[PDB]
Amino acid sequence: SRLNRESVIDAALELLNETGIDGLTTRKLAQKLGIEQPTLYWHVKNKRALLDALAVEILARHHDYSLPAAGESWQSFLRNNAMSFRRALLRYRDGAKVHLGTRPDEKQYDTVETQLRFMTENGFSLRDGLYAISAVSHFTLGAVLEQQEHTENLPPLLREALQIMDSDDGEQAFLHGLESLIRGFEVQLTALLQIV
Amino acid sequence: SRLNRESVIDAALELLNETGIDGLTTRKLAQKLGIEQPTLYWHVKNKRALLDALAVEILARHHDYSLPAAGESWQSFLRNNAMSFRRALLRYRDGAKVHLGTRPDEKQYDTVETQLRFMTENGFSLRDGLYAISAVSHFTLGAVLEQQEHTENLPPLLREALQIMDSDDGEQAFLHGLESLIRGFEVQLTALLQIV
Ligand SMILES: C[NH+](C)c1cc(NC(=O)CNC(C)(C)C)c(O)c2c1C[C@H]1C[C@H]3[C@H]([NH+](C)C)C(O)=C(C(N)=O)C(=O)[C@@]3(O)C(O)=C1C2=O
Ligand SMILES: C[NH+](C)c1cc(NC(=O)CNC(C)(C)C)c(O)c2c1C[C@H]1C[C@H]3[C@H]([NH+](C)C)C(O)=C(C(N)=O)C(=O)[C@@]3(O)C(O)=C1C2=O
Ligand SMILES: [Cl-]
Ligand SMILES: [Cl-]
Ligand SMILES: [Cl-]
Ligand SMILES: [Cl-]
Ligand SMILES: [Cl-]
Ligand SMILES: [Cl-]
Ligand SMILES: [Mg+2]
Ligand SMILES: [Mg+2]
């Protein structure tokens, strides 16, 4: 088959869905493409290069709330940003593991920049704007990993608690924790210089 | 060398430090122990069994703020709990990756139970107590992973922001985000049934 960038990524994503992060090899990406390993090599050097590209390409393709709508509150943006971040990570088996520890690619530099600008304009110190943006990211990743990573006679609450986590996606926990985070930030922002 | 449970774990942890999660194999745990692979097999079946045991054993050994002091506020406990959770994850290379997606072992059942009890007694609905405990966990894991997982000409804020994240551990971001979370929970709790 065709070996341009896009069709390579297509084949990788489809294969990531079949095997998970661990099972994904260059050797298997070749087979899937019906080519020899040395041919693939011209196109992709190794597993690391592939993952970095997938990590970038998954957000580019399916993370569509990178930016705030015209006139959106900062609270609302973060919320939408986080929900869309989450959906994109979950769209692929081990997708969060694929994303873990990637650096903002040159190609989203102006995105991550706009986010920080947007916070600074909303009354955030650059420090605080960055802390809120990281906390959202770290919270969302962490909740997606544990969702995906999961996939002796229980004391009472533990039994019960496990039923409510299983009863849905993990979506309630996530959306509840997200509101906690944003309110916490809000309380901090508005306090300014007061003891809070 | 000696092949009891504790000395096996000792050798695994030391080896996890040498290679990271990916590089850790049974074959190498044998060598390190100066034994043959089939001997090791009697003691440990495979990589999964080893990781589950390490994951449990790292918290047991070095997570010493499992429980609240007598009369501690819930805010204070969560904070201490989270700092101690974090330290324990960071004490080992890829330690957070080792912990990811583990289920509370039978041997900490009464710990995780006490935590939930302790929240319920502090005015939390079982649902809410669980949401706060997960959000803390997910936030802390996520911040530790990205710390550990990290380890084209930058626009201005992005450049600056990256310097402040690098200037320390990631400890400021973490401790700042943690306070946001706890205040957010606090605001929710105290509101009860009011629109909040
Ligand atoms: C805060 N900025 C400067 C930043 C810094 C780091 N990395 C580090 O701090 C790494 N730590 C070092 C400095 C290497 C020791 C970061 O790793 C990140 C980011 C930006 C976030 C932004 C994320 C964002 N959402 C979830 C808040 C988002 O929607 C996008 C996007 N493209 O639309 C992201 O890129 C984002 O999800 C993301 O992954 C970020 C970072 O990776
Ligand atoms: C909330 N409880 C019932 C719970 C549930 C899950 N797992 C899931 O929800 C998995 N999702 C399913 C239900 C399989 C789809 C959980 O995965 C966890 C826990 C408990 C936390 C407690 C953590 C705690 N700190 C960080 C808040 C802690 O200090 C300890 C400890 N031993 O001292 C923990 O065990 C803890 O860190 C931890 O890892 C938890 C869970 O793993
Ligand atoms: Cl074709
Ligand atoms: Cl081609
Ligand atoms: Cl193309
Ligand atoms: Cl000996
Ligand atoms: Cl022995
Ligand atoms: Cl022993
Ligand atoms: Mg990222
Ligand atoms: Mg856990």
Curated annotation (Swiss-Prot), chains A, B:
Function: TetR is the repressor of the tetracycline resistance element; its N-terminal region forms a helix-turn-helix structure and binds DNA. Binding of tetracycline to TetR reduces the repressor affinity for the tetracycline resistance gene (tetA) promoter operator sites.
Positions of Mg(2+) binding: 99
Sample GO molecular function, one term: DNA-binding transcription factor activity
Positions of the DNA-binding region: 25-44
One GO term of the biological process aspect: negative regulation of DNA-templated transcription
UniProt entry keywords in alphabetical sequence: Antibiotic resistance, DNA-binding, Magnesium, Metal-binding, Plasmid, Repressor, Transcription, Transcription regulation
Residues binding tetracycline: 63, 81
Pfam families hit by this protein: TetR_C_1, TetR_N
Start and end residues of each HTH tetR-type domain: 2-62
SUPFAM superfamilies given in the database record: Homeodomain-like, Tetracyclin repressor-like, C-terminal domain
InterPro entries: DNA-bd_HTH_TetR-type_CS, Homeodomain-like_sf, HTH-type_TetR-like_transc_reg, HTH_TetR, Repressor_TetR_C, Tet_transcr_reg_TetR, Tet_transcr_reg_TetR-rel_C_sf
Induction: By the [Mg-tetracycline]+ complex.
Record's subunit section: Homodimer.
PANTHER family: HTH-TYPE TRANSCRIPTIONAL REGULATOR RUTR, TRANSCRIPTIONAL REGULATORY PROTEIN
Keyword Cell inner membrane: no
Name of the protein: Tetracycline repressor protein class D
Species of origin: Escherichia coli
